Design a protein around this ligand. Structure first.
Ligand SMILES: Nc1ncnc2c1ncn2[C@@H]1O[C@H](COP(=O)(O)OP(=O)(O)O)[C@@H](O)[C@H]1O
Ligand SMILES: Nc1ncnc2c1ncn2[C@@H]1O[C@H](COP(=O)(O)OP(=O)(O)O)[C@@H](O)[C@H]1O
Ligand SMILES: [Mg+2]
Ligand SMILES: [Mg+2]
Lengths: 357, 346
């Protein structure tokens, strides 16, 4: 009568350590009365394990050194099964059935649709956005094209590929987008490969760097404003939390938000707050998100709202923006976790009922 | 020692039998001197198996009744491993490692990014388009919005969700899009759940029907023109085959059109291919209007692959034989895997 909730955390990605911290806080917050938790830790090599709750983290208190305890047992997943989809990879021994997955592996694989495809194949219900949406929110070029097509405000930009890379002189790009410019790989996290550009030397350097991480590089016009974030929750009826502010400076990744200044709620007028909330929901809908997402925007001096990013699996530590925003909007961590689980099971039921032939 | 090619086929999809046929044809033609095939058949319940090439199909010679021979071994995948990713799901025994996967599961799961996601995590090189592109080409709504954003022509359309489906009345849709209309689930294959609509009754029926297959429904203006198809092959510098036509049941190859039109459609196929980030292959289907306007109807990332299907026929009629097409697709998968592996993570 209690649902087994498999929390999937860690991962190959550079956000591994932040993922450990999100997981730790969910394990602590989650309502024991309704849910038994199973710890599904992914090591830095990308292999899955079942961890013991008492000793699964080493140096849990210290972000720089925190690590996932090594485990004897590796997991495999069995396509098309509806029970016991997760097994011991060494000997085929089945784990007890997991009723729902809570993925909290930030960035690569976890946030880009790959994990979601795997879970879809294993008929595992899961929290958060599905394959198309996660893949699309992770490719900044694709997400911006969809946002643009929906009539929503985004930074003016161009996308460089391996084959159109040199068709653009730095002069051409400056005449298109003015200065400064930000240059970034299309698929990335946590500001890596991201550079501010004020001249031609910087631009050329910036592009070669970003092309080390992706086959597509986004170059976009610099936007002046406050960075405001908003937490969206739901499937068919998305609800927007109050907004929060993040302050990033130019002076300087195992800490969520890279240890930047975070204030909740954003010290902005409620009318602007509501305008950003409504826009965050349109963004959510345009990108086909499910379960939750965090929408990050720029607020200019004249209160124009420019969408910067949509994150489908945001930091979920006890002090991360996404949970804090809901806590400030009347929804506590525990109830948030439960709401996300409930939404995941409803969406699973909806998908399951669809005809195949 | 030859590259082991894992052919993934069948699947829990309406197009199951088609897939079975596509794989039979691939197995039959693949260059046995370069490649060892391993047959990764997926039954209709969606469970994977290893099949034997000498006896894996029942009624193989009969287009209806053709089915996958039941197998003892079911299969599991081990995330994170770079070798022996596929194991006996009962006892953990690994299969010898497969060097490349040729997915040919049409439609749901196989063609919509799910399978690709699984393969990406398993570090298995694979033929055809990757996670986002496969997912985006499968969702007609997303594919159309991307094509429109690129400045390419699509059928004017509205997209219905469970929350808005009752907002638009037949009369309002009609003023917007004219008649007749085509109503389609956003994510489906080969005309499943697709209806032509000429009046209100048909409309409500069609819409209710599409909503049994997907949570999004596309309603489009009917386009008047010839149905032309074009095969696209490659990654970074894709080539377009000559065009083929579908006639009132009859497949005509090459399509009887002026060379300028052939080349105009070809260049548009390629733009659509790039816009949607397709890799390895796709078939682009268009309407060619009476005034030579080209309207993109769809992009198939895993098109039917029988030696008689359109995609392989367009290549044959362009000078590229079926065995050789298969080999080039495998090479392309490997080239892309290697290029992806050279991207830095830090
Ligand atoms: N167009 C822009 N205008 C102003 N600042 C930008 C722009 N693009 C990026 N930045 C700055 O760089 C930071 C990281 O960029 P972002 O696109 O969010 O990449 P990531 O996905 O790595 O977080 C932003 O939070 C913002 O401060
Ligand atoms: N908008 C349209 N205008 C004219 N004919 C259409 C339109 N949409 C579909 N058709 C006809 O219906 C057929 C099936 O529709 P299609 O979208 O190709 O289904 P699927 O994508 O599942 O193959 C098309 O090949 C074409 O003959
Ligand atoms: Mg960001
Ligand atoms: Mg078609």
């Amino acid at each position: 009568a209690k649902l087994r909730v498999g929390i999937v955390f860690g991962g190959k990605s550079a956000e591994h350590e932040v993922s450990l911290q999100s997981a730790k806080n969910i394990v602590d917050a989650i309502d024991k009365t309704r849910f038994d938790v199973v710890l599904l830790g992914i090591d830095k090599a990308g292999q899955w394990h079942v961890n013991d709750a008492e000793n699964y983290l080493q140096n849990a208190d210290d972000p720089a050194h925190i690590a996932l305890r090594p485990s004897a047992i590796s997991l495999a997943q069995v396509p098309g099964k509806h029970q016991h989809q997760l097994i011991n990879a060494q000997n085929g021994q089945p784990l007890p059935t997991v009723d729902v997955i809570f993925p909290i592996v930030h960035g690569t694989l976890g946030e880009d649709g790959s994990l979601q495809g795997m879970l879809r194949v294993a008929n595992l219900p899961f929290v958060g956005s599905d394959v198309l949406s996660s893949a699309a929110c992770m490719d900044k070029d694709v997400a911006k094209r969809l946002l643009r097509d929906a009539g929503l405000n985004i930074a003016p930009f161009i996308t460089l590929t391996r084959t159109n890379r040199h068709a653009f002189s730095f002069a051409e790009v400056e005449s298109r987008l003015g200065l400064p410019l930000f240059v970034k790989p299309a698929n990335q996290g946590s500001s890596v490969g991201v550079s501010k550009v004020a001249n031609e030397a910087q631009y050329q350097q910036a592009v070669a760097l970003a092309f080390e991480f992706d086959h597509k590089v986004v170059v976009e016009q610099g936007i002046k404003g406050r960075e405001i974030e908003c937490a969206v929750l739901g499937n068919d009826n998305p609800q927007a939390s109050t907004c929060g502010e993040i302050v990033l400076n130019s002076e300087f990744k195992y800490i969520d938000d890279n240890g930047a200044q975070v204030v909740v709620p954003a010290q902005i007028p409620s009318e602007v707050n509501d305008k950003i909330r409504a826009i965050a929901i349109q963004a959510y809908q345009t990108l086909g998100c499910a379960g939750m997402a965090r929408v990050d925007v720029f607020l200019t001096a004249d209160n124009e709202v420019v969408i910067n990013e949509i994150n489908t699996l945001p930091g979920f530590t006890n002090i991360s923006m996404y949970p804090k925003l809901w806590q400030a909007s009347g929804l506590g961590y525990t109830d948030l976790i439960s709401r996300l689980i409930e939404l995941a099971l409803e969406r699973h039921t909806a998908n399951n009922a669809l005809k195949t032939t």
